């Protein structure tokens, strides 16, 4: 093969940390490769999180991070799509679509109820991506935060 | 120590009584009552490494509970808590059980150096909105679901 979407491994973390650090910069964080790599390795070692990466000609182009959720009402599990990012050079080539296609197949393999996520209301690009992938906008619930 | 009311972490010994309230909570969200199913799933959540249950006991009766679980913020490279489920049985409502449960959840999250406590509640749940606003919670993001 020449392109692949697959689960991340320890061997990928050094290159993946660069993209994870770029993703943090998109949301306003200052670049800090040491901090980004440390936290990426903490999430990678956690049993309930799943990383898929898209590789094209041995370069990581993007990633998706999911984690297990529990629904008390249904008495079943689901997945939360927490982070999705494709590096600018590789955008608009289907990397995010392929990453989400794999996340959907993975969630079906795990008999998940659904994949849920939250994205900024003003993030035009992400809304179009999610709608293309079969996600439905839902405003039944309201989020609240207690800042500590 | 001598006390008559307490908010404390749940133990295996509390699960049989706690399952009654957990079953009522599931019925609040539309599920059919099934004590066996509710208890089985409550025990599965209790056995998740990052889940934290607090229960409120008044005169040896469990009046209510809160269930929190660990969240990871990739942007901040830090952890936070999600307040997933909150419930007080009707006989004990409007006595401060939920306020006391959330007061303890806040102290617990501060002990763990969490960034915040976040939650989602139904947009039509006017009682919960008043509770969360009283406790210091604040109402930018849109939820999407893929039902697989
Ligand atoms: C819940 C969360 O975690 S939200 C996190 C959202 N992530 C971000 O916004 C990070 C910054 N942005 C990015 O990394 C990227 O632009 C992404 C992830 C949004 C898209 O990655 P890409 O690989 O470029 O997307 P891909 O090429 O697979 O596009 C698939 C669909 O997404 C939509 N889309 C992607 N980019 C755009 C864009 N710039 N404008 C409009 N729609 C877009 C389209 O529907 C597109 O289908 P199409 O090309 O046939 O029209
Ligand atoms: C919401 C709920 C947890 C409140 O529990 P509670 O122990 O009765 O609440 P408290 O007595 O601690 O009340 C604290 C504050 O919440 C608000 N509140 C609680 N019940 C309310 C009601 N029926 N109407 C309006 N405000 C209400 C008020 O701000 C109240 O402060 P006040 O009594 O000084 O005015 C309870 O009604 C419940 O279990 N409801 C069903 C499940 C649910 O909605 N859970 C939350 C979503 S998971
Ligand atoms: Br490879
Ligand atoms: Br992984
Ligand atoms: Br659900
Ligand atoms: Br494609
Ligand atoms: Br897999
Ligand atoms: Br569902
Ligand atoms: Br966003
Ligand atoms: Br006790
Ligand atoms: Br125990
Ligand atoms: Br026991
Ligand atoms: Br109820
Ligand atoms: Br849990
Ligand atoms: Br009493
Ligand atoms: Br007593
Ligand atoms: Br009891
Ligand atoms: Br504790
Ligand atoms: Br925060
Ligand atoms: Br508010
Ligand atoms: Mg949940
Ligand atoms: Mg997160
Ligand atoms: Na660090
Ligand atoms: Na930040």
Residue numbers in the entry:
A (entry chain B): -1 to 146
B (entry chain A): -3 to 135, 138 to 146
Give excerpts from the publication.
Here we have uncovered a GNAT-family acetyltransferase conserved in A. baumannii that is responsible for the acetylation of 1,3-DAP in A. baumannii in vivo and in vitro and renamed accordingly as Dpa for diamino-propane acetyltransferase. The crystal structure of Dpa reveals topological and functional differences from other bacterial polyamine acetyltransferases, adopting a β-swapped quaternary arrangement similar to that of eukaryotic polyamine acetyltransferases with a central size exclusion channel that sieves through the cellular polyamine pool. The structure of Dpa revealed a dimeric architecture with a conserved acCoA and an acidic polyamine binding site formed at the dimer interface that shares properties with other polyamine acetyltransferases.
The acidic nature of the channel likely facilitated the access of basic polyamines into the reaction center. The active center of Dpa is very acidic and involves residues Y21, Y25, Y65, Y128, D80, D81, E116. The large R90 sidechain in Dpa pushes the adenosine moiety against the α6 α-helix.
